[PDB]
Enzyme design. Structure first.
Site, mmCIF file in Angstrom:
data_model
loop_
_atom_site.group_PDB
_atom_site.id
_atom_site.type_symbol
_atom_site.label_atom_id
_atom_site.label_comp_id
_atom_site.label_asym_id
_atom_site.label_seq_id
_atom_site.Cartn_x
_atom_site.Cartn_y
_atom_site.Cartn_z
ATOM 1 N N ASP D 36 0.847 -1.234 0.000
ATOM 2 C CA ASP D 36 0.000 0.000 0.000
ATOM 3 C C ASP D 36 0.875 1.275 0.000
ATOM 4 O O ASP D 36 2.103 1.169 0.216
ATOM 5 C CB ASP D 36 -1.044 -0.059 1.118
ATOM 6 C CG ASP D 36 -2.362 0.631 0.802
ATOM 7 O OD1 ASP D 36 -2.385 1.590 -0.042
ATOM 8 O OD2 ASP D 36 -3.343 0.197 1.367
ATOM 9 N N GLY D 80 -8.606 1.360 -3.452
ATOM 10 C CA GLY D 80 -9.646 2.317 -3.858
ATOM 11 C C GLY D 80 -10.252 2.990 -2.648
ATOM 12 O O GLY D 80 -10.445 2.300 -1.615
ATOM 13 N N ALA D 119 -11.307 -7.047 -5.796
ATOM 14 C CA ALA D 119 -12.295 -6.870 -4.712
ATOM 15 C C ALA D 119 -12.673 -5.412 -4.569
ATOM 16 O O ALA D 119 -13.587 -5.208 -3.786
ATOM 17 C CB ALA D 119 -11.776 -7.417 -3.404
ATOM 18 N N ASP D 149 -22.449 -11.313 -1.046
ATOM 19 C CA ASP D 149 -23.915 -11.126 -0.862
ATOM 20 C C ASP D 149 -24.559 -12.510 -0.984
ATOM 21 O O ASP D 149 -25.450 -12.788 -0.190
ATOM 22 C CB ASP D 149 -24.463 -10.029 -1.734
ATOM 23 C CG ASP D 149 -24.193 -8.606 -1.258
ATOM 24 O OD1 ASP D 149 -23.501 -8.399 -0.282
ATOM 25 O OD2 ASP D 149 -24.686 -7.724 -1.894
ATOM 26 N N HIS D 176 -22.969 -6.658 -8.422
ATOM 27 C CA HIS D 176 -22.838 -6.416 -6.964
ATOM 28 C C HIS D 176 -23.319 -4.979 -6.729
ATOM 29 O O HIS D 176 -22.789 -4.098 -7.426
ATOM 30 C CB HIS D 176 -21.419 -6.716 -6.432
ATOM 31 C CG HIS D 176 -21.232 -6.390 -4.986
ATOM 32 N ND1 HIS D 176 -22.069 -6.871 -4.034
ATOM 33 C CD2 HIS D 176 -20.407 -5.519 -4.352
ATOM 34 C CE1 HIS D 176 -21.733 -6.402 -2.857
ATOM 35 N NE2 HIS D 176 -20.727 -5.545 -3.018
#
Lengths: 314, 314, 315, 315
Positions: D36, D80, D119, D149, D176
């Site tokens: 990161d 994100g 993801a 979900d 999604h």
């Protein structure tokens, strides 16, 4: 009590394999082995012990029927095989007398756990174990069509290149020659198996042979290496974990009938929900015309033999 | 290649049990079974398959020696047992000729994975497997004193009421009658086992019998149920996972000697670090006067028999 | 009970939320109650954690109150506020003693008869307090104690030796915190003295005293990077929780009740101990060399005066 | 590679940190790199997560840069920024497209030749983008899509039927987000139609449309209680990651590349699919009843225009 106690009765190839499979899985902290020849059940505890240095801890020992007083789970693999010139009716009559001699002393010990019955023929002897013990019907779990379901699943896996665990395909009826594959209720990913069959160019033809190969896999395996045990050993370990982990897991088993499939007063192969009380729920699946006719044919047959057997045993 | 391929050679009781233990553990996605009688190795793949419906997926099939070209791991349990009126030297000479007939075609297939050798006598045949293959010494892992270590651990567990996994107790030397328990290096929770012995009122006396019971457990188990296999099957599964999961795990094995214990040009029972390259590191433990004398006595003996055997094999 | 096992978590902070997730992954305990002050958070967490159960073992996870403890096998106490900047260790002590009194009284009032595992900091003071305030036998209050820092020491000695940390048998011992030590003389890899491994590997006396010191500072160093530390103790708690629920009699470093071991009594302190369904089965009294004999004595005398003044103040 | 397996995590937020911890518990992948922006946090996390390895399987966990991907088997993109209050979904889309371009370019520059698992939200737009921007075959970009979900739907239908959620074969399908649906007509428990289970259990058409709607709102409901949701997707990511690394050919609901299934092409969208070492092995095209046929069409047309305008804008 502080930890979970399984009793195996019958330490043949099926029973031994079960004990080893439960040793690998680290299921049940205490494991009692009960059979006639005490020198063998001892040798087996000594051999099985050695695994617990690499798997989870387990106190495995040879015992007698009295060990069941504080058992959570009794697994009955006790029975003699089919000797040549022995008919199925003689195998039935011989094995009923063996199961009477196991159930009576288990119940005399004050055992109030769950039975799982694996001795052949398994749906007759699950019936018998319930009749002889007086136990509520849901606390006698039959191994039933678990193995042959596992076999249909492994065969349909290889044919479709799908993890066998995601083939929701059930062998149903009396474990043995009168059983069938519930293909119309069978799915992969929610998608009907008969739709997968038609896109994969797999005929009605091939599926009836796939079904017949499941029925003959015992024979084919016996004819190659003398016996079959790893399949059922694993099926027994899996039903054993649904009970001891209180899972409410969906498994094809010998399940007590109370109106499902138009049947009563009978154990027979269906998907059931399995938990700490044994059979939680029968799952009554849609049968097409052929499957409905095989379930009726399989059940009526199984009922006459199981009731004459109990009548003759007395 | 996309997934891990074990080849078992030798599908007797030890080998079969190993395959089942790896089926329960979900270790290796592809499992090849190689033996002489192809109808048996086939029956066994068919039987073992049935477990994969409840465990992890696994493609198990019967093969020949050529399957090793793309193997990560070859497990050699191949060998004949000790026939009565067969001396140890005849057992050695018979088994060396069996292991030559396994190693040569594996190496001809272009196999460049790791050997784990389990055939008895295991430290002679680990030596032989390295001589015959030409493989670097660290890529031939011996089963060695893994089992009998597991046995010492299970016996010391029951005596102290300790999870066998936390008894750091090693059987060392040549697997067989000349082996010993390294009790002076042995600990539970960091605490010496000889200190636990003195507080628990466990004499030098009892510990030498505990040691001798480990050496006789094979005999005692054979004498009860005809054979011993679950212990070593599990020890083999455990060393198999250290290799395939690249663990750098500490295990008692038949480990190649290069100066440790004053020994060279020899495989022998010691703790070693095990990883994807096989033996990563020998761990050279402190031996007291008796243990040092048993390791020297065990090793010199093992060396003469392993070198005459290779000389006679040629 | 035994055939359907119930853990209660008290405190759904970072440590407790990680614990519940580790217990979700491992498929240990069929029923898992979360008890904290703010019920909207303990509910949101049970809703997020149940989403796991579709891929892990089945588990009944829910927000509860203290009454849920009646039928619990295991109560895990992570509850307590951490050190505010102008707060002394004595005020952290006095604040968290009054919090643990306020957890223990309603656990006991529920009729709970299972085992405590105490993780709230300072852990060996608060394990002492949980035992005094509960009336429970010493064996049924298990302190997380030096489990995590033992885990830290083992992982650091594993990177240095390229050995599986699970085979590095080294303990951190004493009071969890600045006074604790690495029992290096009793430490072993496959039965080999670690001090011998140190001398072959060219790892000097001073590098081992730094490794020991680096374990005591790891919390600070992690808090300074990412604000908090939780995955270590979450795991240590899961591991002690498995030894109890599986009746393992496994050897773990923990805050263990003292009855003469190390010349100590009426104290919980970091030692390897055998852990089963009855909690602490057996304290392992390990041999201490001259430095770590003096570190255990120094650590224990200190921890005793603070635990006795604190309980005197609370009571 | 194969014999020592390396996952790279990109994005060490709540979702990614939970993923790494779930992969620590399960003992999957021998080497785990965290990439990161803020390296002091990715380091603090690798230090906290390694403490687990003393009780779980061994794992080499460390903070890295994008170059680490060269020898990776699997790159997991959680990276994100989430939706700011005055931000429209279009601006969330446009912001996160520019972020994923800035992750993908250096992954590809490292010489990485393994599988992507995407993801980052919105997940089916960004799985589309990861494929366009990487040049990788469609099968080697696996979208987490409707896995979570699906897990939510299964856990809700499991509480209602006291069935192990692992045996409730119900899929959430479509994009999604808000346009997604429960494929209830294809859903089953031991091979029994779920609509038949619904009629015996006295669960009406309207209760199932609410259960479906309650799945779409679970994220909001959890975020409103505890600020964020992560244990669900952390688990879903671990499960898809195990099907790839163990070459399982397991059936999972995912964001799967379309080639004619549902009358769709050149789109990633939520369907059950067979997942192995090569990523998406096989899309399962399930039968849709008249309502869910129209929900799949509506969901897919929508997702297509946004993914094509977004990539047109980015490019």
């Amino acid at each position: 009590k502080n930890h979970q106690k399984v009793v195996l009765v019958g330490d043949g190839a099926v029973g031994s394999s079960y004990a080893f499979a439960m040793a690998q899985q680290g299921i049940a902290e205490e494991f009692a082995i009960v059979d006639i020849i005490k020198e063998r059940t001892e040798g087996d505890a000594m051999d099985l012990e050695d695994a617990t240095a690499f798997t989870a801890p387990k106190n495995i020992y040879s015992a007698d029927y009295d060990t069941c007083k504080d058992a959570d789970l009794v697994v009955i693999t006790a029975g003699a095989p089919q000797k040549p010139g022995e008919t199925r009716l003689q195998l039935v009559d011989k094995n009923l007398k063996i199961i009477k001699s196991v159930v009576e002393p288990i119940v005399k010990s004050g055992f109030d756990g769950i039975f799982l019955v694996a001795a052949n023929p398994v749906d007759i002897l699950t019936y018998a174990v319930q009749k002889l013990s007086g136990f509520p019907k849901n606390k006698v779990v039959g191994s039933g069509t678990s193995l042959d379901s596992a076999r249909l699943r492994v065969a349909l896996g290889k044919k479709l290149d799908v993890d066998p665990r995601d083939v929701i395909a059930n062998i149903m009826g009396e474990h043995g020659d009168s059983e069938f594959a519930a293909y119309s209720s069978a799915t992969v990913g929610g998608k009907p198996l008969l739709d997968i069959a038609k896109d994969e160019g797999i005929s009605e033809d091939e599926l009836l042979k796939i079904e017949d190969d499941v029925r003959n896999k015992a024979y084919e395996i016996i004819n190659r290496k003398g016996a079959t045990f790893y399949g059922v050993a694993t099926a027994l370990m899996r039903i054993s974990k649904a009970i001891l982990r209180d899972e409410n897991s969906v498994l094809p088993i010998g399940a007590p009938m109370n109106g499902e499939y138009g049947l009563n007063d009978l154990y027979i192969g269906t998907p059931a929900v399995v938990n700490a009380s044994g059979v939680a729920k029968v799952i009554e699946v849609p049968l097409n015309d052929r499957e409905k006719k095989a379930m009726a044919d399989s059940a009526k047959q199984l009922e006459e033999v199981a009731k004459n057997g109990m009548a003759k045993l007395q």
